[PDB]
Amino acid sequence: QRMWWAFLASSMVTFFGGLFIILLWRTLKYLWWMTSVKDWAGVMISAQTLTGRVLVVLV
């Protein structure tokens, strides 16, 4: 009658299975405007950027 196992297992699988699929993707790669948005997301968050400063203060 207790649902705690679902709440725990949700985080447990969200960590473990995602790490496992990342490792599996790396193994498949070994066996075998994205840059623009990546740099944009990296330039919002910074120690020098005011937007990153207010973002970390807010979080």
Swiss-Prot record:
Query: According to its UniProt record, where is this protein located?
Result: Cell membrane
Q: Which residues of the full protein are shown?
A: 84 to 184 of 1236
This protein's assembly is summarised as:
Homotetramer; which constitutes the calcium-activated potassium channel. Interacts with RAB11B. Interacts with beta subunits KCNMB1, KCNMB2, KCNMB3 and KCNMB4. Interacts with gamma subunits LRRC26, LRRC38, LRRC52 and LRRC55. Beta and gamma subunits are accessory, and modulate its activity.
Q: Which disease is it linked to?
A: Paroxysmal non-kinesigenic dyskinesia 3 with or without generalized epilepsy: An autosomal dominant neurologic disorder characterized by absence seizures, generalized tonic-clonic seizures, paroxysmal nonkinesigenic dyskinesia and involuntary dystonic or choreiform movements. Onset is usually in childhood. Patients may have seizures only, dyskinesia only, or both. Epilepsy, idiopathic generalized 16: An autosomal dominant form of idiopathic generalized epilepsy, a disorder characterized by recurring generalized seizures in the absence of detectable brain lesions and/or metabolic abnormalities. Generalized seizures arise diffusely and simultaneously from both hemispheres of the brain. Seizure types include juvenile myoclonic seizures, absence seizures, and generalized tonic-clonic seizures. EIG16 is characterized by onset of seizures soon after birth or in the first years of life.
Q: What does this protein do?
A: Potassium channel activated by both membrane depolarization or increase in cytosolic Ca(2+) that mediates export of K(+). It is also activated by the concentration of cytosolic Mg(2+). Its activation dampens the excitatory events that elevate the cytosolic Ca(2+) concentration and/or depolarize the cell membrane. It therefore contributes to repolarization of the membrane potential.
What does the UniProt record tell us about how this protein is modified after translation? Phosphorylated. Phosphorylation by kinases such as PKA and/or PKG. In smooth muscles, phosphorylation affects its activity.
Annotated transmembrane regions: 4-24
Q: Can you tell which superkingdom this protein's organism belongs to?
A: Eukaryota
Q: Note on file?
A: The protein was initially thought to contain two functionally distinct parts: The core channel (from the N-terminus to the S9 segment) that mediates the channel activity, and the cytoplasmic tail (from the S9 segment to the C-terminus) that mediates the calcium sensing. The situation is however more complex, since the core channel also contains binding sites for Ca(2+) and Mg(2+).
Q: Could you tell me in which tissues this protein is expressed?
A: Widely expressed. Except in myocytes, it is almost ubiquitously expressed.
Q: What is known of its domains?
A: The S0 segment is essential for the modulation by the accessory beta subunits KCNMB1, KCNMB2, KCNMB3 and KCNMB4. The S4 segment, which is characterized by a series of positively charged amino acids at every third position, is part of the voltage-sensor.
Instruction: Say which family it is in.
Output: Belongs to the potassium channel family. Calcium-activated (TC 1.A.1.3) subfamily. KCa1.1/KCNMA1 sub-subfamily.
What is the recorded name of this protein? Answer: Calcium-activated potassium channel subunit alpha-1
